[PDB]
Amino acid sequence: IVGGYTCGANTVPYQVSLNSGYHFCGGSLINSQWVVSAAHCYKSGIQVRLGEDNINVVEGNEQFISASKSIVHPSYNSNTLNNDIMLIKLKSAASLXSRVASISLPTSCASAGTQCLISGWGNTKSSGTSYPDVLKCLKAPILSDSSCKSAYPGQITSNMFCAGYLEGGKDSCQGDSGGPVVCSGKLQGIVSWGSGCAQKNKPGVYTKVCNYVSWIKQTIASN
């Protein structure tokens, strides 16, 4: 997260870290046994880390649970990045309280201008490299489909949406993928891609979770 702030220990209880010997992606807990992340975050031997703040130190509120299943959307396109969503089943049910909690799925899509909370342990620099120990947060608005398409001509599908600030300086970055974009208590997006991070006229692109609600519910229930 570039241009954000320190969330505060466990202030984003649904945020999880995907670990494969180190943190490589984020995710959002939607129930005691399921996590939503990005399809490009599919990796071998994933371990989901819940209740995390300082990603490099054991603070006492962590729950490390291996993924028992990793279902990438059947229509995920690794070239166009369309349908960039993945569901991860936890090998054992996570213990839910205040520090570890699920985030509700949306009932409808969010409108342009809606303020949302984006979080993650990704790079905090637009030019250079600096990965945080603690979880970073960023408040950013949903942008119009027209502005998103103007920013990325011929790249935005009906399953993607832009969020951020066109002047640059505030954005999600490498290490944030799969993480949440929560608006009004609903999971509206999944950190997906963009041209660099926090660049002018290049807002972050996110998977439109509101288009997959029925698929998410049915898939979880059938696994």
């Binding site: 180190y22 943190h23 490589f24 992606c25 990005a38 490009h40 975050c41 990796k43 690794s78 070239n79 990045l81 990704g122 790079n123 490299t129 990965y131 999600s172 970055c173 490498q174 290490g175 944030d176 993928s177 799969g178 950190v191 997906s192 891609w193 963009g194 041209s195 991070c197 972050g204």
Partner: protein, 57 residues
Amino acid sequence: PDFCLEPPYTGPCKARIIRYFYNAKAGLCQTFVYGGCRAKRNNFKSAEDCMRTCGGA
């Protein structure tokens, strides 16, 4: 064009996945951050894969 001589490509996706690339200047396989999508060929999952494919380039 030898793909082993191309600079490492992070890509547009925002994951922080550690991969290997052959650094021709240093003459060795080095680590770099891969974003998770649209990988180029000088991107390997292990130092061994990198050396086997690009060693001596």
